[PDB]
């Protein structure tokens, strides 16, 4: 049966209703704030985490960006479930009323944790998320739409007992110190929601691996230590290692036990393989101070760039290289905006603050980032190329924008922060942290983790190390083009 | 080569053309009435019944609801094929000319049977379907569009030698007696089309189970007899029974014959399991007079309901419960209609007759039924919640509408009619019969069967028993709200 | 790193850029002509040929037929790869700038070959394609859009060292001799692009079968020699042969080697089966002068046709039969064009030249070809039926259009040309060659090959033999309707 609980929370009460709706779900709540309401259920099934968010139109008046809010719920949820879970986990979040003030998206993130705790599914939570804006000089928790439209900051922080799990931000060239303060200010309200989820819990009363390891470990060390090897080559080399192991398992007959224990898991080969590769890259990074391609922990990959790659029809052309990550940006100017597709939100969030006001430049601006090769932050290459293409097209942008992605190896007390991560530094690492911006401050953020979280102290260090990467990449794209062209394209 | 046959049929001749089109199909006919023509083919392939209906736009003038007509053909076809058929059966129906009088949908249903008989595929037919309308006090077979738009009744009856297989109706608060008479009047024209399909046939010249049964039967009795068990629990209990049987089959080695006879059918476990559960629920119902949750054969599940579940932005809110079936209806009012989605046709067919005339209420009315839990007629919960939400929104409806679904166990001479069926009463039963309406009469019908049909006499009894369910559910939703609110929403 | 190469080519230089873009691709080039640029990559992966073409909108000005250009690249590529290739082959072609003169489609075809050679994937190339138009009396290689819109011819020729692999044409009732000359003129520029791809290559420095054969061969001869057997029957007969072979392989236990060599390839049964059937149909055709249904190598299947199959609402009705290939065409006339769908491009390419000028006939013309049975050229049946339906609707077309598909068996020095091919003559043959047109000349072409190519000399013979088929089919559709009706439909 139904139970309300109110939580006093920065002026806007957050109300939870359990026992009201979806009685066949593992756990459920109507989480409500003001007059915004979203229903969040969670169900473990025999079988793996599907999160569907719906924004109903009757919630505001029905007449004849949801996938982003789908990922916003999923990202901080995923790495809190134990890794050995193989049952199906269905999370549904339907927004059923929009108050013209309260945005529902952070409400659904918090409800997802609440609903998983009521379904008493093992996970290392609870988690919560808040939004932080900035009006004048005042940070504000869960601002309305009005402050989002008027203010200088729009960031989401999700955390848990073990720290911050997700950040997602737009900002108007905010300095690192204020971004760090906003993150910290918002993680403290996350903790206030962690408590009172813990209060709700109290209230309502809630063989083969060794085989592979021994055969393959000393082989993986050496590929990981071969710094002259490019990413394609090291991928073809680690594949051959795994292939010979498969051949050895195939050679022995059905009589051996591990062949049956391996035909009982047609994938364990890959999982243990990656886990051995993860371990040896990590020890390579923590004790030795070198990454898998020989670079220092602060070193940025070699950067290349050019302008006007395409004919002057394409109003703006820009090619960017970071190692084997390649992006070609194309700029179109039109008539009666500002948008950008990625074959996207992160880079238009990162470009917008420097786009000139309608008064000066009345074209509608259209940027397409063709990702032609991927090895790290293709979304940061998309930002960098976008700026180049806008400068080739004569768009009088305030400042050029650049960005890089940081990584993290966290081996106990040992913590290392990587700049401009290789793909497998992202796959076998603990953090994917994109930061974009200008000479003056930050414009866009995006953090994903595969562990239960990080302290704010380590986030501050990654944000400081990433300004150096952004500075180095930007101060070397200006050797391709230092100003926007004074004139536009004859076909613009 | 081509052959015509005309059938004299209530004023409108029905013409069939065989040997004309689709010469690689098992069987085919252009069935035509007036100047409406639809081509219906049927092909058995080695491999399971796919029915695709297409309504071409050149049929009426091509310029730059078909899935419902797809189901209308499929539903009365499916349960006439023997259950042991595993070959692929492709039925295609293309409407190739619309006469502005004759609706083609019932033509395609009849052709589907004709085409299956020519392909000489085993099935317990023939079947046919007709439409019945009512103009003034005159029932009429296969009315035009004009009578459908003007009249008081729009029902489809499909039958076969063994009785009626499908009904689908809209009506304007018609009393049960007239609905029963229309069904009977239309089944008699169905029989007139059964004959003359039989005339066409004459013219053209057309080990493991016992193992599972013995291990599991006395176990299934007891779960089925445990009335205090909720539906989730009894589902988790019957699963454990099947799981232990799987474990026992896995325990014995490849040496036993049934393990190979079971690895020859990776599903027979479930089929025999369900067949044992079907048998014991049925004997539970016929000899004992009790259902699986302890209810009498006329008993309706406990009903709950409330109004204004959502904030007053949502112009109308209504939550309905029947056992573990839960529906939340939401009402939106707008400006320059009447429609309803289901996450739909049956409930707008059932609400429409009480919607006020434009003169009084000029808003466009929009209802969304969120099905939050399913255990029986979620479409009838959708009707009930819709009425509640319309009453919360101040829509001055003529009368409130409610509905329930009836079921049938037919064990030979023994026939039992269930009210407000549980899911497995629908899965392991012989009939799913939805009836909706008001204090005065019926508004909407929908019948599906998994057997070859029922006599009209049993249909009359299910329709009478269902008025009692509708009455009980309605007379207990008025204890939540007895009148529409005199005023609308401040945000309407 | 990046390398340009220019190729002097009929006035319009073709420039190639390698080492510039997509550095993780097997091979890549920006191929450019004038200011049209398309990027073409090619990658072999462990696993089968996927070709994706994209036409970006920024290439011309981006604002808020590609599948045909996808097939145009794929068709001449496919049969140049060795048949024993099982690795994945990804070909991507992005058009990144449209010059208002140069059409990019033939550029991507040529780049696909260039990119495969740089990825040094085994294939029997290189290939190239060009477009040929006709302005006045001047053939022109790779015309602009202006000549395409104004001229009389629009054909694509793709070839390789072994001959022509693909043709695709629209034309205004061009005589066979000029079509043959255009093909030959364009294949010579294809050879000029073959060379200078060879110059680039030089520059940059680039048991079970016998079992099945012995069991089944003398059985397949006899089904193939049974001329009174219809296509369905011979398909059911060859299936039984393969089924008994499967039974024999199943009868023997795991002890035999071929059962394990056959459970190592769960498809080799079909492949060897088809390969035996291919061989014996081919020897049936080359030494004996008879096809599998008893027809001569120039014989057209029996043709049937009728007009007004549907009610006079359907402004035009036409049913065409060639053997078991059946098409029903339907004609709609409207108001403020000329298009045709196929349930399409080839038949509107083939009808357009005889459609009357706006001055005389101002309706918008809409033709739908329902393919009701397939055994050969359903697209040529679509042309023939379209003409019939246009004549039933009173459209005053200049001349009626008809067409047929030719085939080829090429057994070494032995070369046989088939008219109006059966399905398996297309599956087990070397060529599918559709030609459509009128009394005066040709209107539409489409050639596919599964071998590395044919000499122009054999193409000239197939084009001459196909005029006879078109003539015979047309001069026998006029015995159904010899003129368009002087008046239109009462419902037109
Ligand atoms: Mg990532
Ligand atoms: Mg049902
Ligand atoms: Mg073909």
Show residues of chain B in contact with A39, CB under 8 Å.
372
| DSSP label at residue B140 | E
Residue among B402, B380, B400 at smallest CA distance from B390: B400
Cβ–Cβ of A328/C35 closer than 8 Å? no
Show residues of chain B in contact with A24, CB under 8 Å.
232, 324, 373-375
Q: Which two tokens stand for residue A289?
A: 């101070």
From chain C residues 61-90, the ones with a CB under 8 A of any chain A CB are 61-64
Distance from C-alpha of B404 to C-alpha of B429, rounded to nearest angstrom: 16
Cβ–Cβ of A313/C59 closer than 8 Å? yes
Distance from C-alpha of C165 to C-alpha of C455, rounded to nearest angstrom: 9
Q: How far is A315 from chain C (nearest CA, A)?
A: 8
Torsion region of A323: left, alpha or beta (phi above 0 gives left; psi -120 to 50 gives alpha): left
Q: Backbone phi, then psi, for C305, in 5-degree steps?
A: -165, 150
Q: Which residue in chain B is spatially nearest to C310 when comparing CA positions?
A: B97
Q: Is the minimum CB–CB distance between A366 and chain C shorter than 8 Å? A: yes
Cis peptide before C126 (omega within 30 of 0): yes
Cβ–Cβ of C35/A366 closer than 8 Å? no
Mutate one of B311, B328, B338 to test the A interface: name it (highest A CB count within 10 A).
Answer: B311
Q: What is the CA radius of gyration of chain C?
A: 25
Beta bridge pairs of residue C486? none
CA of C448 to the centre of ligand 3 (A): 6
Beta bridge pairs of residue A370? A328
Show residues of chain C in contact with B99, CB under 8 Å.
311, 313
Q: Is the minimum CB–CB distance between B35 and chain C shorter than 8 Å? A: yes
Q: Which two tokens stand for residue B215?
A: 């291990």
For residue C343, give every residue at least 6 positions away whose Cβ sits within 8 Å of its Cβ, in sequence order, or none: C368, C369, C370, C371
The residue with tokens 């690249």 is C73
Q: How far is A312 from chain C (nearest CA, A)?
A: 9
Q: Backbone phi, then psi, for B386, in 5-degree steps?
A: -60, -45
Which residue in A61, A63, A97 is closest to B311 by CB distance? A97
Show residues of chain B in contact with C423, CB under 8 Å.
none
For residue C350, give every residue at least 6 positions away whose Cβ sits within 8 Å of its Cβ, in sequence order, or none: C170, C383, C401, C403, C436, C437, C443, C444
Cβ-contact A169, A447 below 8 angstroms: no
- CB B201: neighbour CB atoms within 10 A? 16
Distance from C-alpha of A484 to C-alpha of A451, rounded to nearest angstrom: 42
Cβ–Cβ of C368/B94 closer than 8 Å? no
Q: Is the minimum CB–CB distance between A37 and chain B shorter than 8 Å? A: yes
Cβ–Cβ of C23/A373 closer than 8 Å? yes
Distance from C-alpha of B265 to C-alpha of C475, rounded to nearest angstrom: 58
Q: Which residues sit directly before a break in chain B (C to N > 2.5 Å)?
A: 47, 64, 206, 336, 343
Which residue in A368, A372, A374 is closest to C56 by CB distance? A368
Q: Which residue in chain B is spatially nearest to C314 when comparing CA positions?
A: B59
Q: How far is C361 from chain B (nearest CA, A)?
A: 18
Cβ-contact C359, C395 below 8 angstroms: no
Cβ-contact C6, C30 below 8 angstroms: no
Distance from C-alpha of B166 to C-alpha of B76, rounded to nearest angstrom: 6
Q: Which residue in chain C is spatially nearest to B31 when comparing CA positions?
A: C310
Q: Which two tokens stand for residue A200?
A: 């709700």
3-state SS, residue B295: coil
**Burial class, B466, CB count within 10 angstroms (exposed 0-12 / middle 13-18 / buried 19+):** buried
Which residue in B339, B366, B375 is closest to A58 by CB distance? B366
Q: Is the minimum CB–CB distance between C302 and chain B shorter than 8 Å? A: no
Chain-centroid distance, C-alpha C92: 21
Q: Which residue in chain C is spatially nearest to A366 when comparing CA positions?
A: C62
CA of C238 to the centre of ligand 3 (A): 21
CA neighbours within 13 Å on the CB side: how many for A55? 14
3-state SS, residue B338: coil
Distance from C-alpha of C293 to C-alpha of A182, rounded to nearest angstrom: 81
Q: Is the minimum CB–CB distance between B59 and chain C shorter than 8 Å? A: yes
Which residue in A20, A24, A57 is closest to B324 by CB distance? A24
Return the ligand number nearest the Cα of B423: 2
Q: Which two tokens stand for residue B97?
A: 């000319």
Full set of structural domains in chain C with CATH: 3-204 (3.30.230.70), 217-286 (no CATH), 303-477 (3.30.230.70)
Show residues of chain B in contact with C324, CB under 8 Å.
23-24
Q: What is the CA radius of gyration of chain B?
A: 25
Cβ–Cβ of B37/C326 closer than 8 Å? no
- Per DSSP bridges, beta strands A365-373 and A128-135 are unpaired
Distance from C-alpha of C42 to C-alpha of C28, rounded to nearest angstrom: 7
Instruction: Tell whether residue B432 is among the known ligand binding residues.
Output: yes
Q: How far is A36 from chain B (nearest CA, A)?
A: 8
Q: Which long-range contacts link B309-314 to residues 24+ away (Cβ below 8 Å)?
A: B309/A20, B310/A37, B310/A96, B310/A97, B311/A35, B311/A37, B311/A97, B311/A99, B312/B489, B312/B490, B312/B491, B313/A35, B313/A59, B313/A60, B313/A61, B313/A97, B313/A98, B313/A99, B313/B489, B313/B491, B314/A58, B314/A59, B314/A96, B314/A97
Experimental determination technique: X-ray
Q: Is the minimum CB–CB distance between B324 and chain C shorter than 8 Å? A: no
Measured CA distances, B380 to B69, B202, B230, B391, C476 (Å)? 21, 44, 21, 17, 61
Which residue in B24, B59, B62 is closest to C373 by CB distance? B24
CB pairs under 8 A between A and B: 59
Show residues of chain B in contact with A22, CB under 8 Å.
326, 372-373
Kindly state the helix (H) or strand (E) to which residue C165 belongs, with its residue range. Answer: strand C163-174
CA of B432 to the centre of ligand 2 (A): 5
| 3 state SS for chain A | CCEEEEECCCCCCEEEEECCCCCCCCEEEEEEECCEEEEEEEEEECCCEEEEEEECCCCCCCCCCHHHHHHHHHHHHHHHCCCCCCCEEEEEEEEEECCCCCCCHHHHHHHHHHHHHHCCCCCCCCCEEEEEEEECCEEEECCCHHHHHHCCEEEEEEEECCEEEEEEEEEEEECHHHHHHHHHHHHHHHHHHHCCCHHHHHHHCCCHHHHHHHHHHHHHHHHHHCCCCCHHHHHHHHHHHHHHHHHHHHHCCCCCHHHHHHHCCCCHHHHHHHHHHHHHHHHHHHCCCCCCCCCCCCCCCCEEEEECCCCCCCCEEEEEEECCEEEEEEEEECCCCCEEEECCHHHHHHHHHHCCCCCCCCCCEEEEEEEEECCCCHHHHHHHHHHHHHHHCCCCCCCCCEEEEEEEEEECCEEEEEECCCHHHHHCCCEEEEEEECCCCEEEEEEEECCCCECHHHHHHHHHHHHHHHHHHHHHHCCCCCCCCCCCCCCC
| DSSP label at residue C357 | P
Q: Is the minimum CB–CB distance between A233 and chain B shorter than 8 Å? A: no
- What is the experimental resolution, given in Å to one decimal place? 2.7
| DSSP label at residue B136 | T
Which residue in A324, A330, A374 is closest to C58 by CB distance? A330
CA of A432 to the centre of ligand 1 (A): 5
Question: Euclidean distance between the first and final Cα of chain B, in Å?
Answer: 64
Kindly state the helix (H) or strand (E) to which residue B306 belongs, with its residue range. Answer: strand B303-307
Cβ–Cβ of A366/C58 closer than 8 Å? yes
Cβ–Cβ of B314/A96 closer than 8 Å? yes
Instruction: Tell whether residue C432 is among the known ligand binding residues.
Output: yes
Cβ–Cβ of B37/C319 closer than 8 Å? no
Distance from C-alpha of A434 to C-alpha of A49, rounded to nearest angstrom: 24
Return the ligand number nearest the Cα of C446: 3
Mutate one of C62, C63, C92 to test the A interface: name it (highest A CB count within 10 A).
Answer: C62
Residue among A368, A360, A373, A374 at smallest CA distance from A316: A368
Q: In terms of DSSP H, where are the helices of C226-377?
A: 231-251, 257-263, 268-286, 345-351
Cβ-contact B51, B34 below 8 angstroms: no
């Amino acid at each position: 049966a139904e139970f309300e609980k109110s939580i006093s929370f920065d002026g806007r009460d957050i109300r939870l209703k359990v026992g009201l709706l979806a009685p066949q779900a593992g756990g459920s709540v109507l989480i409500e704030s003001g007059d915004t309401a979203v229903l969040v259920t969670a169900t473990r099934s025999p079988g793996p985490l599907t999160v569907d968010y719906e924004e109903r139109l009757y919630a505001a008046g029905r007449i004849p960006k949801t996938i982003l809010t789908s990922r916003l719920i999923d990202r901080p949820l995923r790495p809190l479930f134990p890794s050995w879970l193989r049952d199906d986990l269905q999370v549904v979040a339907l927004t059923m009323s929009m108050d013209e003030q309260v945005p529902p998206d952070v409400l659904a993130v918090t409800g997802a944790s609440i609903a998983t705790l009521i379904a008493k599914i093992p996970f290392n939570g609870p988690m919560a998320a808040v939004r932080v804006g900035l009006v004048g000089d005042d940070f504000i928790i869960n601002p309305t739409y009005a402050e989002i439209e008027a203010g200088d900051l729009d960031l989401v922080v999700a955390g848990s007992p073990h720290g911050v799990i997700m950040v997602e931000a737009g900002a108007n060239q905010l300095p690192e110190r204020d971004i760090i303060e906003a993150i910290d200010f918002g993680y403290e309200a996350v903790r206030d929601l962690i408590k009172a989820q813990l209060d709700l819990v109290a209230e309502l009363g809630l063989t083969l691996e060794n085989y592979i390891r021994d055969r393959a470990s000393d082989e993986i060390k050496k590929i990981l230590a071969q710094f002259e090897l490019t990413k394609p080559e090291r991928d073809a080399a680690l594949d051959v290692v795994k292939d010979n192991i498969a051949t050895a398992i195939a050679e022995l007959p059905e009589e051996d036990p591990i062949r049956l224990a391996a035909t009982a898991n047609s994938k364990a080969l890959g999982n243990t393989f990656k886990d051995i590769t993860k371990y040896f890259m990590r020890r390579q990074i923590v004790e030795d101070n070198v990454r898998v391609d020989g670079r220092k922990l602060d070193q940025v990959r070699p950067v290349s760039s050019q302008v006007g790659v395409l004919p002057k029809r394409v109003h703006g052309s820009g090619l960017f290289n970071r190692g084997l990550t390649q992006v070609l940006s194309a700029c179109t100017l039109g008539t009666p905006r500002y948008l950008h597709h990625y074959n996207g939100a992160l880079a238009e969030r990162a470009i917008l603050p420097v786009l000139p006001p309608k008064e000066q430049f009345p074209y509608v601006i259209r940027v397409v980032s063709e990702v032609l090769s991927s090895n790290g932050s293709t979304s940061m290459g998309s930002v960098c190329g976008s700026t180049l293409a806008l400068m080739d097209a004569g768009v009088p942008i305030l400042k050029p924008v650049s960005g890089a992605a940081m990584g993290l190896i966290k081996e106990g007390d040992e913590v290392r922060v990587l700049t401009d991560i290789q793909g497998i530094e992202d796959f076998l690492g603990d953090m994917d942290f994109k930061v974009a911006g200008t000479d003056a401050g930050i414009t866009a953020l995006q953090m994903d983790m595969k562990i239960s979280g990080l302290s704010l102290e380590v986030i501050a260090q990654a944000i400081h190390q990433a300004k150096d990467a952004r500075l180095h990449i930007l101060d070397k794209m200006l050797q391709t083009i230092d100003q926007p062209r004074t004139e536009t394209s004859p076909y613009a």
